[PDB]
Amino acid sequence: MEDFVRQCFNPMIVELAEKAMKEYGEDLKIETNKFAAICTHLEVCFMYSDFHFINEQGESIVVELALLKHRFEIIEGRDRTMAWTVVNSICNTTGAEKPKFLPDLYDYKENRFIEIGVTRREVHIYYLEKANKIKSENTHIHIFSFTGEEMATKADYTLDEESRARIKTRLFTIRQEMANRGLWDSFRQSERGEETIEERFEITGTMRRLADQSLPPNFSCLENFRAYVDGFEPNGYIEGKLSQMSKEVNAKIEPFLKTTPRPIRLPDGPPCFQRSKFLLMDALKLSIEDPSHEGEGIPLYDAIKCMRTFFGWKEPYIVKPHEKGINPNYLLSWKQVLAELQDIENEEKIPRTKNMKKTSQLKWALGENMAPEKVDFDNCRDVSDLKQYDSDEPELRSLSSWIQNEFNKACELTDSTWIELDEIGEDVAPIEYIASMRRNYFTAEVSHCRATEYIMKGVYINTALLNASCAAMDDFQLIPMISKCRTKEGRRKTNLYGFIIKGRSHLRNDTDVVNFVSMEFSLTDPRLEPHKWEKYCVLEIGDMLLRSAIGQMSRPMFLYVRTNGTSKIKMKWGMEMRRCLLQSLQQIESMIEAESSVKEKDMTKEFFENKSETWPIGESPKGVEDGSIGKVCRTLLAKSVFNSLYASPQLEGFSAESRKLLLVVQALRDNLEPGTFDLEGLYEAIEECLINDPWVLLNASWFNSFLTHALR
Amino acid sequence: MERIKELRNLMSQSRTREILTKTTVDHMAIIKKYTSGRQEKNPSLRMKWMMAMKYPITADKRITEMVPERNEQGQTLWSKMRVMVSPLAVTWWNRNGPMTSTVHYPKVYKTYFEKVERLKHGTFGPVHFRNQVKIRRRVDINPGHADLSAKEAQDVIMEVVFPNEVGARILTSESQLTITKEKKEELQDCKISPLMVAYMLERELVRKTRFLPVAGGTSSVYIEVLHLTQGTCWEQMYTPGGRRGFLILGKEDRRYGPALSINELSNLAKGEKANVLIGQGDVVLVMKRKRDSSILTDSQTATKRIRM
């Protein structure tokens, strides 16, 4: 590389290199290895004939710091013409014959020419070429090396050992510090005998035939195409091609007015149903109330203690059948769970986990005997009634009124805490004070929400089920549902929701499915909205005493049973649900920061402390309603949680298309006279991304309700 | 003893012999990269599962002579099947254990200890909310050392930390950098680690720059607090506050005795010759010097031989 040569040699040696190259007719940018070779040869030549003078008596001495012979003649630094002239003059005044090529140096003492060679390969092979090139004449030749070797004819090293050691050390150091940078390989692979070649690369074969078939249709060889590309000048091509093009190719703008947009069309059919892992609005808890502050125990015994505090069991019976399957199996499963939980006392030693018996009804519920068998296609070639796969068009379902009810209930406040975060260091800088105040207000507003309870429930259940799946692999294990919280007075509490029975878990990859059955308590009668529960079988198990108001009254208790099987990936998806809190905080902070830039001040106090501010977040037959900042915080948190709980591609598609439409509508509202190229296609995409899911349909209804108000 | 017997059986196998004989020292780092590419099997879950087990970490054999098997509670601290130990052992060591002086720490980690001094003795100002435009410059995150380029920093580090593996250059020059003497004098009996010391010295002495979208100060002091000063729509004002001459005659000779080490050239003589191992494997014959061989005007004096 050029910079290496510039910083390695002194300018006196460097200057002659360009003069040598200019006469030859080369370049320093395209060719670099030849530059280094020439510089090295010149420096070695000058170092070989320095500090050497001969006295009048004929002896040779070495001195430093009168008119004595210098014992050597420099030839390399001169152009070709006077290089021949000086050799002719000396050979005439000494009677020597013209050798052939140019010798490098001449010695008065021995009256013979010397050639100096520096090679990158080993010395032995390089001596023969020089020996054959020059013959039948008196000319000593000396060869150095980059690894500390040398070789001279007749083994007559006409020099002191120190001078040779200096050259060898210089070459060794240059080689080492050039290899330390990444330049030795190319330099070594550049000597083709007695010249220097930068690189070599040819097609020469099958690649030539492959190349000749990768051209525009009016060419046959690569060379002709290259020549045509090289001899190209742009005259008028684009203008002519545009002129001879039809006018049906165009992009006409149609304006977007106030009367242009239309409501989105929603599908019709039978109503939709519930498909969450655990039910949300219709759950109750059996509290153990306060545990001892030092009590950290196994979940099984916590569940048993929670169970003991209840009296009021009855004889179970079915109030809503599954209309697909066998319900007596569900009854027998519940009875078996209760009996096996009671039968712990018939054991010498207390177990840590409970493994259920492999019974007929449990085997039916977990699907252990509907496994197809796998054989090769050759034997079953002639069989009949064979279909490709479940390639069936998805069913279309309409929108009901229970999802809005769930969302309404999810935005309310409770009497517990559900989350307690750690501490950080004390604050010094003002920006730290601002950040602390923002996050403290947000945390105080969203601490008691129900969505936090949903988050904690999901985290606990998924973690427990993943641990059980990884630990016990061939057993039917019983897993309780448990959450923890702090009461208003300051007492810890433990809650129980139900039970889960797990099947067989032999999971090699992240797609394999493990089946399970779930049981949950409730006080909601299933016969008020039968269409909501379509994958459930509901039993009646007992009565509950309510202490609310004056007197005591009894209400029935129910149980919800269902078969399901999730994943290994979706377990990990469920174990991370605090990112919803992170996202909500980020959204609020972004809204504050956007407004802080227009009104160039700090607007965090005008958002929270002010009590006269209202935001439109609701709808009613009267019109659009308003709320406070805590309400919008809880609404955003609930929206994030429900997005996490109902993931599907339809959500992604709808979000993208609705974002585009919302941006266009805002541009219209800002008096910027917008326009569109194809408005029907955007809609058509919106409806084709609207097949079956209830959350997506609710979002579409919300968008329609927004559209009917923003332009009226 | 163990290393040579491990080397002996590698050349017994024919496939490894070709590698060991056909690969130069210059190509060790090339073949070092051929290891693997698939390990990320959810490390967080793996660590959570491993911390549940008893005896999850490993230690040397001599731990059994320094830490008791059980504590006052009666809990096992280590077990025998390198041995297996528990985190309780680490906590016990931090609670009860031998003490040593830590006087060498503030000289090995001083680049970290200057940051806290800068931060504690600093003052703060007001914060402004507005909009601003940020442009890019060349910023220096490691100031480095004055009067020292990147070429000699590596030389200094090699001399200080690995005195027996220097070669060619540094061994033929006639000089001695001042900073090397103080670094070698101070770090006389430090037993922390050669590699940690090497990395810390490299971080202290070597300058390196990058591109950043800075809208404020340009010096190295203002770059390390760039996350505290700037923002999307705000700016915070803050001031910090505050080796003899040798030559190579050729390769090894069988008529001048066995090879020596670099640290054993001290005895030497006034012009004898002996072979030594320099760098990472090369053995060469060297001899002491008799003249100066400097870089003075004598190089330019050759111009008298040209342009007469």
UniProtKB/Swiss-Prot annotation, chain A:
Molecular functions per Gene Ontology: endonuclease activity; metal ion binding; RNA binding
Binding site for Mn(2+) 1: 41, 104, 115-116
GO biological process, one term: symbiont-mediated suppression of host mRNA transcription via inhibition of RNA polymerase II activity
Short sequence motif Nuclear localization signal 1 (NLS1): positions: 120-135
Names of the cofactor(s): Mn(2+)
Keyword tRNA processing found: no
Modifications after synthesis and translation: Phosphorylated on serines and threonines by host kinases, including human casein kinase II.
EC number: 3.1.-.-
Catalytic EC class: hydrolase
Matching Pfam families: Flu_PA
Keyword match Hydrolase: yes
Role summary: Plays an essential role in viral RNA transcription and replication by forming the heterotrimeric polymerase complex together with PB1 and PB2 subunits. The complex transcribes viral mRNAs by using a unique mechanism called cap-snatching. It consists in the hijacking and cleavage of host capped pre-mRNAs. These short capped RNAs are then used as primers for viral mRNAs. The PB2 subunit is responsible for the binding of the 5' cap of cellular pre-mRNAs which are subsequently cleaved after 10-13 nucleotides by the PA subunit that carries the endonuclease activity.
Protein name per its UniProtKB record: Polymerase acidic protein
Native source organism of the sequence: Influenza A virus (strain A/Northern Territory/60/1968 H3N2) (Influenza A virus (strain NT60))
Swiss-Prot record, chain B:
GO terms (BP aspect): 7-methylguanosine mRNA capping; cap snatching; DNA-templated transcription; symbiont-mediated suppression of host cytoplasmic pattern recognition receptor signaling pathway via inhibition of MAVS activity; symbiont-mediated suppression of host gene expression; symbiont-mediated suppression of host mRNA transcription via inhibition of RNA polymerase II activity; viral RNA genome replication
Organism: Influenza A virus (strain A/Northern Territory/60/1968 H3N2)
Pfam families per UniProt: Flu_PB2_1st, Flu_PB2_2nd, Flu_PB2_3rd, Flu_PB2_4th, Flu_PB2_5th, Flu_PB2_6th, Flu_PB2_7th
Motif (Nuclear localization signal): 288-291
Full protein name: Polymerase basic protein 2
Keywords (A to Z) from UniProt: Cap snatching, Eukaryotic host gene expression shutoff by virus, Eukaryotic host transcription shutoff by virus, Host gene expression shutoff by virus, Host mitochondrion, Host nucleus, Host-virus interaction, Inhibition of host innate immune response by virus, Inhibition of host MAVS by virus, Inhibition of host RLR pathway by virus, Inhibition of host RNA polymerase II by virus, mRNA capping, mRNA processing, Viral immunoevasion, Viral transcription, Virion
Gene Ontology molecular-function annotations: RNA binding; RNA-directed RNA polymerase activity
UniProt keyword Iron-sulfur, yes or no: no
Family membership: Belongs to the influenza viruses PB2 family.
Functional description taken from the UniProt entry: Plays an essential role in transcription initiation and cap-stealing mechanism, in which cellular capped pre-mRNAs are used to generate primers for viral transcription. Recognizes and binds the 7-methylguanosine-containing cap of the target pre-RNA which is subsequently cleaved after 10-13 nucleotides by the viral protein PA. Plays a role in the initiation of the viral genome replication and modulates the activity of the ribonucleoprotein (RNP) complex.
Subcellular location: Virion; Host nucleus; Host mitochondrion
Gene designation: PB2
Subunit organization: Influenza RNA polymerase is composed of three subunits: PB1, PB2 and PA. Interacts (via N-terminus) with PB1 (via C-terminus). Interacts with nucleoprotein NP (via N-terminus). Interacts (via N-terminus) with host MAVS (via N-terminus); this interaction inhibits host innate immune response.
Species lineage: Viruses, Riboviria, Orthornavirae, Negarnaviricota, Polyploviricotina
